[PDB]
């Protein structure tokens, strides 16, 4: 029993983290096989960040300008190329600690673990969701750039996120491992609008199911609803509209608890309309949306890597 | 910016986890140097758990009854001894992945990371506090026994917790690495009272400081208080009494924010008495007490391992 925001074990990623420097500040990179991946703004001075011409800035750099260090082991850079907002630095040594891995572009509302690093060294790990508006609410300081987000399935690390930037609003923006931003963002020091965000309905429901499994049952009521009715309420409270695809994804949890999805929706409806009246659920006084249906089953059934 | 419940990177501990079996069920052990540490109830059948005579049960076991496996690598057990509620299994091979490490008995109100494991394999990592009543609110299923709690400072893993038991109330109890329970608990399947618990005042204050650093400032008021006045309120709301030692520990955060400790106490007083009026702090609608003053500085200054 119990329910926590659990991250994946970070070891396999820890063995891939390096430091990359290219004339000024140091950031993190990710060493897989014989390639180091890092944010392209490693080549920028503080002044460059205002309006970088990355192509021009990169042209001034050579292989030998990239200093890459894995712990105290210097790596030798033998090629470099820019791909969207990332640099790929070819090194002469394959990382011996490379895990089985894939690059994945995740969907909004999905979750992942972040290994926050500074100077190529791991500081901490936490679980994040990709917000509907393609920001993440992380914990990042200057120099965390290049830290990655990931999931692990069986032996395989699916990298989905590289950290680039804190927006002026204090939320975080980054790319997939091919250097494509999530969301409308660009890598420069400008004010940039994030979408209006919404609450991830399917995740809140998953977390209500987790609560029931864990014995928190006070919010279960005698009402039901329809997808249409529920979605009126979802609209009013800035929740994502629920679809049959979401209902299908919730099937396992519905089966485990014996509580029909639309019955749980009616519980959620009542919580949205009446609040929690100073009660808690799973140690929270708000409706939590950073756990997927997969996350709940993973944790409530003890799957390992 | 941002503030998350951040765990330590788990890699150094992942390399120490093994599976231990001794006639029935498998649990986890911790392999350091040439010793494997695990819960002593690895020697118990389900029936034994009701009222185990551990000394008698252990006498029936020999070195060769302990099957220890590190991934797919069998270890050979060449001695065993019981120490309080743990077994120490001497193996013929020193773990090559042993980190610099210490065993520590932590204080109530301190925090640590838990590497939840099953069958000697890591499932996930999260941050926990030791409650004032010496329970932890974890996330554990059957077979998680032997999972450990730890802190990392520079290169050194301080093991402070080994998981033993879920109480009938759904909170968790365990030992230090010398096998001494935290709290009044014993390793048998009985109803056992935990103390009345309290909120960790010094941690709530630390987290209020974290909020200010992160820009959440609405709860700062024009009042101050005294330690004596504040402690009347602390009493009423089942908070730990604040001492000058706690004030001293909060000094750095007070200096960083320019907010005197007793001024922050007066903010806390007002929150306790009036609630949050449907607002949030650092994404929480309650007063959070699982971050130490050290935790806040660690995260807000980006210290690595
Ligand atoms: O989460 C983060 C990351 C970081 C952040 O956001 N950006 C950032 C700020 C400064 C530099 C920098 C460049 N060159 C130097 O020689 N010295 C520097 O210091 C690089 C990136 C940044 C700013 C705008 C655009 C982009 Cl793509 C990155 C940062 C700074 C403060 C707090 C949090 C964070
Ligand atoms: O967090 C936990 C750990 C676990 C839990 O609490 N206890 C536990 C339950 C069963 C066994 C067991 C022994 N021998 C077998 O052959 N098969 C078994 O299955 C061992 C320990 C336990 C119970 C009482 C006292 C002690 Cl010291 C340990 C457990 C079970 C269910 C849910 C959570 C947890
Ligand atoms: Na960039
Ligand atoms: Na997020
Ligand atoms: Na035990
Ligand atoms: Na706890």
From Swiss-Prot, chains A, B:
Reactions catalysed, semicolon-separated, are:
TSAVLQ-|-SGFRK-NH2 and SGVTFQ-|-GKFKK the two peptides corresponding to the two self-cleavage sites of the SARS 3C-like proteinase are the two most reactive peptide substrates. The enzyme exhibits a strong preference for substrates containing Gln at P1 position and Leu at P2 position
**Catalytic residue positions:** 41, 145
Q: Which domain of life is it from?
A: Viruses
- Tell me what happens on changing residue 90 to R: In strain: Beta/B.1.351
The record's subcellular location field reads: Host cytoplasm; Host Golgi apparatus; Host nucleus
Domain Peptidase C30 intervals: 1-305
Q: What is the effect of changing residue 132 to H?
A: In strain: Omicron/BA.1, Omicron/BA.2, Omicron/BA.2.12.1, Omicron/BA.2.75, Omicron/BA.4, Omicron/BA.5, Omicron/BQ.1.1, Omicron/XBB.1.5, Omicron/EG.5.1
Q: Where is this cross-link: Glycyl lysine isopeptide (Lys-Gly) (interchain with G-Cter in ubiquitin)?
A: 5, 90
Activity regulation per the record?
Inhibited by pyridone-containing alpha-ketoamides compounds 13a and 13b. In turn, alpha-ketoamide 13b (tert-butyl (1-((S)-1-(((S)-4-(benzylamino)-3,4-dioxo-1-((S)-2-oxopyrrolidin-3-yl)butan-2-yl)amino)-3-cyclopropyl-1-oxopropan-2-yl)-2-oxo-1,2-dihydropyridin-3-yl)carbamate) inhibits SARS-CoV-2 replication in human lung cells. Inhibited ex vivo by michael acceptor inhibitor N3. Inhibited ex vivo by compound 11a and 11b.
- Outline which residue ranges sit on the Cytoplasmic face: 1-305
Q: What is the effect of changing residue 49 to A?
A: Does not affect ability to cleave and inactivate human TRMT1
Outcome of substituting residue 142 to A: Does not affect ability to cleave and inactivate human TRMT1
Q: How does it assemble?
A: 3CL-PRO exists as monomer and homodimer. Only the homodimer shows catalytic activity. Interacts with host FBXO22; this interaction promotes the proteasomal degradation of nsp5.
Role according to the record: Cleaves the C-terminus of replicase polyprotein at 11 sites. Recognizes substrates containing the core sequence [ILMVF]-Q-|-[SGACN]. Cleaves and inactivates human TRMT1, preventing tRNA guanine(26)-dimethylation of tRNAs. May cleave human NLRP1 in lung epithelial cells, thereby activating the NLRP1 inflammasome pathway. May cleave human GSDMD, triggering alternative GSDME-mediated epithelial cell death upon activation of the NLRP1 inflammasome, which may enhance the release interleukins 1B, 6, 16 and 18. Also able to bind an ADP-ribose-1''-phosphate (ADRP).
Q: What protein does this entry describe?
A: 3C-like proteinase nsp5
Q: Which organism is it from?
A: Severe acute respiratory syndrome coronavirus 2
What gene name is listed for this protein?
rep
């Amino acid at each position: 029993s119990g329910f926590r925001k659990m991250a994946f074990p970070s070891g396999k990623v820890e063995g891939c983290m390096v430091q990359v420097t290219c004339g000024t500040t140091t950031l993190n990179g990710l060493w897989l096989d014989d390639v180091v991946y890092c944010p392209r703004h490693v080549i920028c001075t503080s002044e460059d960040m205002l309006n970088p011409n990355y192509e021009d800035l990169l042209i001034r750099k050579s292989n030998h300008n990239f200093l890459v260090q894995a712990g105290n082991v210097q790596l030798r850079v033998i090629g470099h190329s820019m791909q969207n907002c990332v640099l790929k630095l070819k090194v002469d040594t394959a990382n011996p600690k490379t895990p089985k891995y894939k690059f994945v572009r995740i969907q909004p509302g999905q979750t992942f673990s972040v290994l926050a690093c500074y100077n190529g060294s791991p500081s901490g790990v936490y679980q994040c969701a990709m917000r509907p508006n393609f920001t993440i609410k992380g914990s990042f300081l200057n120099g965390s750039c290049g830290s990655v987000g990931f999931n692990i399935d069986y032996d395989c690390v699916s990298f989905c996120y590289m950290h680039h930037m804190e927006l002026p609003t204090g939320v975080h923006a980054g790319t997939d491992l091919e250097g494509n931003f999530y969301g409308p963002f660009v890598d420069r020091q400008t004010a940039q609008a994030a979408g209006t965000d919404t609450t991830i309905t399917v995740n809140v429901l998953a977390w209500l199911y987790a609560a029931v499994i864990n014995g928190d049952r006070w919010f279960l009521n005698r009402f039901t609803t329809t997808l249409n009715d529920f979605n009126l309420v979802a609209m009013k409270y800035n929740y994502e509209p629920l679809t049959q695809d979401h209902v299908d994804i919730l099937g396992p949890l519905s089966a485990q608890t014996g509580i029909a999805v639309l019955d749980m929706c009616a519980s959620l409806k009542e919580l949205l309309q009446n609040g929690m009246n100073g009660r808690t659920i799973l140690g929270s006084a708000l409706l939590e949306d950073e756990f997927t249906p997969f996350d709940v089953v993973r944790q409530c059934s003890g799957v390992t890597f």
